[PDB]
């Protein structure tokens, strides 16, 4: 969308990840796996919570009655009241519609943003050891066992360890 990941260069979402909002799938010698990223997921959930908290804050403002339900209201003042009440209702509906339309547009973009921030975060961590496939995957140009994969997910992967092997495998020279 605004940031190009969700509904963008990422083909689709993972129904099988009930673990969090964003995450990893890896393929290696040992096989496959799936693990959700906690920091990026909570970054998005906390912002949704921030919206839900603003929504629910109650500014009242006790109102009393200006329209009798059980007796006749003089016609001129009743028409002023009606007209006033409808103009105000028109205003509140318009805002309620604007709020929800604006908030949602921003929610789906910020969520796209957290996805992209994590993708960028991983990309920089592998620097010259992998390449982007264009679909949100990094092709790693060195052997990477589960302890290497878990280090990528845990943000501790040391690019200096595999650079030599990777550049070799990438450039196909030297």
């Amino acid at each position: 969308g605004l940031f190009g990941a969700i509904a963008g260069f990422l083909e689709n979402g993972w129904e099988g990840m009930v673990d969090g909002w964003y995450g990893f799938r890896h393929q290696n010698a040992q096989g496959t796996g799936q693990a959700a990223d906690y920091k990026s997921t909570q970054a998005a959930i906390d912002q949704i919570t921030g919206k839900l908290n603003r929504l629910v804050e109650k500014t009242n403002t006790e109102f009393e009655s200006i329209e009798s339900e059980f007796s006749e209201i003089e016609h001129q003042i009743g028409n002023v009241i009606n007209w006033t009440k409808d103009s105000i209702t028109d205003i509140w509906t318009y805002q309620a519609e604007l709020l929800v339309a604006m908030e949602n547009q921003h929610t789906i973009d910020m969520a796209d943003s957290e996805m992209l921030n994590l993708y960028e975060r991983v990309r920089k961590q592998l620097r010259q050891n992998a390449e982007e496939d264009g679909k949100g995957c990094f092709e790693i140009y060195h052997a990477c066992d589960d302890s290497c994969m878990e280090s990528i997910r845990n943000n501790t992967y040391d690019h200096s360890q595999y650079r030599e092997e990777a550049l070799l495998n990438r450039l196909n020279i030297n």
Binding site: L55, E64, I140
Partner: protein
């Protein structure tokens, strides 16, 4: 050898509105407009008065339906539909301003006028329109003054009430308008009839008028009810020669309360701060489509069944 990035998806997505898409599917949403109300009056925590078939104006003048509501203290007042204001038929001048004034009070005290009458006057006049113990009565806070001498001219009398209290006083009185020339002459005599009322702020005059009228509660006569606020330290004087429905008791409205007009049942177990015709409303949601007419602390009324807020990301299933 490769690692892949992704986000979650669900099978069942929800539709929300964005600035650009009327039909965007996200993973989860929440409602922002409350459509569910309670069919009761949640009166927990509040000292309430259910007026029943007593109308608030009947509280001041003493209609028999309002006998249990002549005095009291409340923070919320419940008016029901088809509540009775009058036994002997009549109307009240500026009734809505007076009703609202009562429905935003937090209680009522009654103080005696201390009005006294000469022997030539019957102050305990009575009517079949007003029934207590199955017998003829009258407004409890009023006295129908009639000549004891049937057909003889009501004396030129004067009654002053003095507010000795530190607060203003709601005073009400009536003006009789008979249904026949005979009825008038019997009660008040053949003399011209004038009633004059004067305080430091309010002054007025009333003339009883004979007229043929349909019967309400068996009476074709009418009573016009009138009221003012006697300010503290002020005196108000009634000068009259027949036709005055005099006050034996005066009202004083205490503090502030919430006035509810509803025919909903009372619930003393649930709590609330928003009310309307159909009951109570309890939500943290900023919007409701229950009613444009509400009282208390309420969510703003909107013309929508639903305005869903996205609480999740775009749903891209596969």
């Amino acid at each position: 050898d490769k690692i892949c990035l992704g986000h979650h998806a669900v099978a069942n997505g929800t539709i929300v509105k964005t600035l650009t898409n009327e039909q965007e599917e996200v993973t989860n949403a929440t409602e922002t407009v409350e459509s569910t109300g309670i069919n009761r009056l949640c009166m927990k925590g509040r000292k309430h008065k259910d007026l029943g078939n007593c109308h608030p104006i009947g509280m001041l003048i003493g209609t028999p339906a309002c006998d249990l509501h002549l005095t009291g203290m409340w923070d919320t007042l419940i008016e029901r539909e088809n509540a009775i204001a009058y036994c002997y038929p009549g109307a009240t001048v500026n009734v809505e301003a007076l009703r609202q004034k009562i429905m935003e009070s937090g209680g009522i005290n009654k103080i005696s006028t201390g009005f006294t009458y000469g022997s030539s006057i019957n102050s305990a006049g009575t009517t079949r329109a007003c029934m207590r113990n199955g017998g003829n009565s009258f407004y409890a806070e009023l006295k129908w003054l009639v000549s004891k001498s049937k057909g003889q001219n009501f004396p030129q009398t004067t009654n002053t009430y003095r507010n000795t209290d530190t607060a203003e006083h709601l005073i009400m009185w009536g003006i009789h308008h008979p249904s026949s020339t005979q009825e008038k002459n019997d009660l008040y005599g053949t003399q011209s009839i004038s009633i004059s009322v004067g305080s430091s702020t309010y002054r007025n005059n009333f003339v009883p008028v004979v007229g043929a009228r349909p019967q309400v509660n068996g009476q074709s006569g009418r009573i016009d009810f009138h009221w003012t606020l006697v300010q503290p330290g002020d005196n108000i004087t009634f000068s009259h020669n027949g036709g005055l429905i005099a006050p034996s008791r005066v009202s004083k409205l205490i503090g502030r309360g919430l006035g509810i007009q509803s025919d909903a049942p009372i619930d003393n177990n649930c709590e609330s701060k928003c009310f309307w015709r159909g009951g109570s409303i309890n939500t943290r949601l900023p919007f409701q489509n229950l009613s444009p007419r509400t009282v208390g602390q309420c969510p703003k009324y909107v013309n929508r069944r639903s305005l869903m807020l996205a609480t999740g990301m775009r749903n891209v299933p596969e």
